[PDB]
Design a protein around this ligand. Structure first.
Ligand SMILES: CC(=O)N1CCN(Cc2cccc(C)c2)c2ccccc21
Length: 113
């Protein structure tokens, strides 16, 4: 029963939506950590210093590792920025990231006061 605890509940709701069937078409690459053993991803860890994904953010929320919504937000944006940094700007996964980020940014912006 506080301002910060209510906003963190909203964050959990936002992430739940991101995991929903509704967005699955473009959200799926962000579900689990980038598999750096996959062909073509041998250099991922050379380029991406701080990997992030939605399962990791979910575990961090559930282990209460986010002091506030801004910290949760930073991890969501890290995930997207990693995608934009690593992949070629014309790769389909970049388009998918933008589609999911549009969902996130709209919900995050309209979090209650
Ligand atoms: C999020 C991210 O940077 N990557 C790396 C590129 N990809 C590879 C890839 C290949 C075809 C279609 C798509 C949408 C994606 C990928 C795949 C599964 C999980 C993560 C990623």
């Amino acid at each position: 029963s506080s301002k910060v605890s209510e906003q963190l509940k909203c964050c959990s709701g936002i992430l739940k939506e991101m995991f929903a069937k509704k967005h699955a078409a473009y959200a799926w690459p962000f579900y689990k950590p980038v598999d750096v053993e996959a062909l073509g991803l041998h250099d991922y860890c050379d380029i991406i210093k701080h990997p992030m994904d939605m399962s990791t953010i979910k575990s961090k929320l559930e282990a209460r590792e986010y002091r506030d919504a801004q910290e949760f937000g930073a991890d969501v944006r890290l995930m997207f920025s990693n995608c934009y940094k690593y992949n070629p700007p014309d790769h389909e996964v970049v388009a998918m990231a933008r589609k999911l980020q549009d969902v996130f940014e709209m919900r995050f912006a309209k979090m209650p006061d």
